[model samples]
Target: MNIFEMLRIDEGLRLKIYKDCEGYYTIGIGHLLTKSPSLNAAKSELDKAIGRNTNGVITKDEAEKLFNQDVDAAVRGILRNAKLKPVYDSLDAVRRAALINMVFQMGETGVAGFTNSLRMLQQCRWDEAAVNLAKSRWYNQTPNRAKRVITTFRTGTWDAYK
Candidate 1:
């Protein structure tokens, strides 16, 4: 599966505002409105996009737009990260997508903190990277997604997309 398919499944689509696992006010396929410049401003833009005040709802098209924007941001974040850039450059497409998934869920800084795991990944030590990733708090926080991502890193394949 491609990264879009993988993320669509993992993030889950939502047209209405909902709380994420971290309790952030979010909407539009995991877009954290709370993290936006202003929650009301973000909602206003959503309203404009839908051509009406949706209260808390958005259109599927709008959600997809937000999803794409978020994905782009995540990718740019990875490219800009000194710690992750070289490792990302060295990875295969699947593994790079897996890393982008991690950045999407967490953030560039969060992924950058995985120094040992990144080192292992940089060297293409799949098994060691998987083991190290599994030991993190992120894994504990969201084991299911983490396991899938870690497995992708280990195998350098899309088998985890299943």
Candidate 2:
């Protein structure tokens, strides 16, 4: 789904989305749209940030280039990482979509840092994984988002269009 589509913006959420995108940190939708040279740019930027963050081997400037090159590559790199793949692969389509949404918000490193949650998913411990996922820093930072994703994970249902 498209970013806008996935966000499922209502008037309130729309304004919030705009403000967040246009906010000081240039985070969330803001960063994606701002640095996105093209449709591909968004995915590339995501990749670089996630890759660099997770591996701790690449520089921000280098990752920045991917944002300029191809946004999908960055996204692909994140999905391909061994640490993220198990949970990603185990998720149903809706849950996967929600996870990707979270990844866009939190970055791969942040998502991967959920060592306990990832392990739970890898072991097919769905209930534990859901609980662990809710206990992350992302949850503290974005309670609404965490609630939504956790709900989706627990129910195996999510409205991707929203």
Candidate 3:
């Protein structure tokens, strides 16, 4: 097969709409401009691609796309923050990964609202940080996942990752 054929075979062509690694408006076989896609923007592009509700999606090479860029960006964003940087930078890799997951999933604004929780981590107060986040709306979203993150922060074990 040719290179584009190989790519097409691997990237799986889609006839509908979907979000990319960074939640960008990507359709066809991994075609995209250099920007993330919000729902409204994506909807607009979707209509342009498939010409209405007929189709607009990309069948990606799930193998390579597994590691999402948004995840890393979210973590990097936390590191760049003036407020979150102190505790975020100081924590061990284990606890740091746990919270980075939180930051990624919740977004900076969401995590920033975690005032008391962040303070605990800044103070190197593992237990308090864990407990504080545990009581947060974040925890309310996922009971079991919250436990894993909470344990990682509290004990610095990061076992959930293992």
Candidate 4:
């Protein structure tokens, strides 16, 4: 069908703030409407109010406000999910950030789905954890991305690629 129809099917036509997979406040498919919103983008949307590129607009304002919101969420995911936090903290910056991005995309609950993999990580078994990461529906759904992250995990460095 059309591009609009495809996006609706893939991202859903959300009109207001709702938790994305990782529990970020999201609106209108995945337009963000937050998370460091550009001053120009917000004002531009407000100027338009509703319609066209703004996409049924009525979005938030201020980069600081959006940054705080996203940071609060990132912290909560690490703090709230007791299971995922230590492992998240243990990795080096690049690797830990990969986990954060993973948690963002999959949610702490979904990341918890990889408990076995995480457990391997808890034991400092990087290669095993990396391999363990692949044993899931996530790998099935996102093989390329999974491979990249697993490589990073396995290597203990940020050499993320095939």
Candidate 5:
């Protein structure tokens, strides 16, 4: 499956503003509304896009569109990282989705902190990569998502979610 499909399930669809696991103001399939340069402006744009004045509310279609944009940004961020591109390029679709999923949640900088895990992935040491990922705070904080992504890293399959 593509990153959007994967994340659509993993992240779950949220049509209204809610605090994420880490307590950030999130909406529209895990979009961090707090990340926008101007939170007020972002809210206005979202309202306009969904044709609703409610601050936290979004239509399903608008949510999907925002999700697509977020996923594309994650993909671009991953590819633009010189250190990550080679490892990212070497993986198959499922494994690549695993990386994209991580980037989508944590941003490129957060994922970059896993130097050892990245190395293991680059070397095709699947289990090693999984183990390293499991030891991180990201895993501790979001066990379900992390476990699925870790399994994706290990097995190169979508069966973890299935």
Candidate 6:
């Protein structure tokens, strides 16, 4: 099955995904961008925007074309940046998904701003990354989310990305 199929994303959410990108005709998930007619588009979009800011990282012109003013579009944008690909690729699928979810809320730079977390992941310091991930300002502001993702990363059961 495709990742989206595995994720059990409902059509309503799928429609929401398509609608969120209204005029863009494409979307990104994780580290890839693709045309919107395919599942990859939604998946990639969701992966990029989960934990980042909507402004600056995305230009207003592009935003207008893509109908990207919504939280969903913003979250997807962050998840799809090149800098984050390595970190996302290093984790088990579950942990990666959780991180994607985190990034959707935090923004690309916001997540990247977690210098210690990125470093830990780069060194395969899973435990340290989990700790640092949970202790971030992003985490502090969203304790429930932080707790869940940290738990997933710690236990190696984080699958939530597309």
* TM-scores for all predictions: 0.89, 0.58, 0.62, 0.58, 0.89, 0.49
Give the candidate order by descending TM-score. 1, 5, 3, 4, 2, 6
Residue ranges of candidate 3 with Cα displaced over 4 Å? 1-57, 60-67
Q: Point out the higher-scoring one by lDDT: 1 or 4.
A: 1
lDDT tens per residue, model 5, 9-62: 888888877767877667889887775455676677667656768766778888
Clashing pairs in 3: 15-56, 16-56, 16-57, 17-56
Cα lDDT tens digits, model 4, 46-146, are: 33434335433443443234334544575578767889887877777656656765664566788877878888877879877877788888788767667
lDDT of each: 0.86, 0.55, 0.60, 0.59, 0.84, 0.52
CA shift at 12, candidate 6, in angstroms?
Answer: 13
List, residue by residue over 1-162, the lDDT tens digit for candidate 3. 222332343234554455555466655554442255466667566565444453344334432342244445666798788777887778776667766766745568778788887887877888767777878665785666567667878887634544
Q: What value does the lDDT take at residue 162 in candidate 2?
A: 47
Clashing pairs for predicted structure model 2, backbone only: 21-30, 40-71, 43-71, 43-72, 44-70, 44-71, 45-67, 47-74
Q: What does each candidate score in C-alpha RMSD?
A: 2.7, 10.2, 9.3, 10.4, 2.7, 12.1
Deviation (Å) of 33 in candidate 5: 0.7
Candidate 1 lDDT, tens digit per residue, 16-51? 877787777788777776655466776776676556
Residue 18's lDDT within candidate 6 is 35
Pairs that collide in candidate 5 are: none
Candidate rank order under lDDT? 1, 5, 3, 4, 2, 6
- Model 1: lDDT equals 0.86
Error of 4 at 141 (Å): 0.7
Q: Measured by TM-score, how close is model 1 to the native structure? A: 0.89
Q: What is the lDDT of residue 33 in candidate 5?
A: 70
The regions of model 5 sitting more than 4 angstroms off are 35-53
Candidate 4 clashing pairs, residues 3+ apart or interchain:
none
* Model 6, TM vs. native: 0.49
